[PDB]
Point group: C3
Chain length 205, copies 3
């Protein structure tokens, strides 16, 4: 199983250092306990260590769009606990695992999923899930080992979250539908509230 | 070409040893001549050699969800004639080919298909086909070598089988829509009859 | 950026040597400045060098369905300037780059795209785009380096071209909807006119 209370990952792509603390505090306040900042965000090497230090003991804090082994090294030193990727790159996964970090790497096919498992991944991100649909994951779950947690990422909304959870997703990574670069802290708190609400109702249902 | 009379693969995921002979006898009686038991089925190393021995000379008998080279070795000894996979793993394919077994490995992209061909695959499984659609295969067939048999697997029904065959599939692997773990032998005979009927009408049309 | 005026690739699959010059002249006359002949076209080693010689200084001329390193070598000698593929094969890409040819290789997942970039690809073909949709590319563009040109190929029409361009595609490769083996030169001029018109209106809009 995913080892954090609520299985939702807040993905804050394009957030800047001066806004990182407020937006992360918003998502955590609303119920999130996993947050990551993509490495294609401006000055991520300022924002990430800041959020680790403010929130590292309140939420699973980490990074996304992690494409090179050497980034894993840098992120470990920053106190990153979580590595999310758009792709399967075996040494990235192996290296992150080697630090005792939680890795949720991104695959899109059966072949790619089993490569990620062989690299030591304990969870999988299906990215982008929107093109494939809930049924894709349901089909993947019929071949994946039972204890592998699958996360839908890509076009997941508070409205459709239910269908991902029904299909067999342990949870979801939420990007643009939760945070787009330059939206208000109030919008972040609104969307994060919506997703937490949608998740809780989904389990109930 | 596929070298079995009717190009449909019966996939009996989660079948138990005590039910294997009856359900396989049902599908074969209805017209199937390829059957496989996924290795994520309980006690598959009891069911598979049993079905090889009862039916090996009446149908192409084998295994699915074959993920490790060492499983191919074990299955060869059991008298498996057919290896089906959800993914492309070159040594699995090479090893199975090396035994003179029929391999139908699972790919989802052009890149993965050409890797499987280079490993010696003579047929391809597109898995899961449902997310992609008939048109996906039609598009893949415009680049694949002409004599490669393509099998749709994933969300194929007796109702939509026609559209897969029209799109260029040589045949289909049928899983949950044919057999779900714990359904009656009578249900297996019903669904297998439906698929054989749908296939025959599809060629006619 | 793509370094040719209009970012549309004419793909003439199955064209024969005796028709190559007329059909290529049609597409170029209509506004195309990239054209390729797939290597699964009959007698491509006659058609390609012919079109390089007639049109090489009027358009980006090259080949598609390039699957083996040794084909790249042969095509270089023929004066091919452009290599298009259905799949990601690192040495094909590296070899073509090594000749100073423009490579637009085909990928379908994030993992495959980053492999192609690491092989030196400066542009990407998403193939087949039709199964995935415009939103797939939009999602891929959120992780790809900003300056990588993405081309939709597979089920692109003059009617839907707009939506690919809106989604973030720098352009498109047009196959069966532009040229099918055995259609008239007049049909090629008609479809090529339609695509150029659709593209120009798309930028305008
Ligand atoms: C994984 C990719 C993911 O973060 C993208 O932003 C797509 O998700 P949305 O469509 O924005 O929800 C990664 O960055 O590691
Ligand atoms: C291939 C995968 C296949 O067997 C799955 O069960 C999906 O098919 P259905 O959706 O059940 O029809 C393999 O096991 O090798
Ligand atoms: C890339 C594949 C492409 O050329 C195929 O023909 C699919 O495109 P259409 O559906 O025909 O538009 C390659 O050949 O390198």
């Amino acid at each position: 199983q995913w080892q954090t209370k609520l299985p939702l990952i807040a993905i804050l792509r394009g957030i800047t250092p001066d806004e990182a603390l407020a937006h992360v505090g918003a998502v955590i306040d609303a119920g999130f306990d996993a947050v990551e900042i993509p490495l294609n965000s401006p000055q991520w090497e300022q924002s990430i260590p800041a959020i680790v230090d403010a929130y590292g003991d309140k939420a699973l804090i980490g990074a996304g769009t992690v494409l090179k082994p050497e980034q894993v090294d840098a992120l470990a030193r920053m106190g990153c606990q979580l590595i999310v990727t758009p792709n399967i790159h075996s040494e990235v996964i192996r290296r992150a695992v080697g630090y005792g970090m939680t890795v949720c790497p991104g695959c899109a096919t059966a072949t790619e999923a089993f490569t990620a498992l062989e690299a030591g991944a304990q969870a999988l991100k299906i990215f982008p899930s929107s093109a494939f649909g809930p049924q894709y994951i349901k089909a993947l779950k019929a071949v994946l080992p039972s204890d592998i947690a699958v996360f839908a990422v890509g076009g997941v909304t508070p409205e459709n979250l239910a269908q991902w959870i029904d299909a067999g997703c342990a949870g979801a990574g939420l990007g643009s539908d939760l945070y787009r670069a330059g939206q208000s802290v109030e919008r972040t708190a609104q969307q994060a509230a919506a997703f937490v609400k949608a998740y809780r109702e989904a389990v109930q249902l």
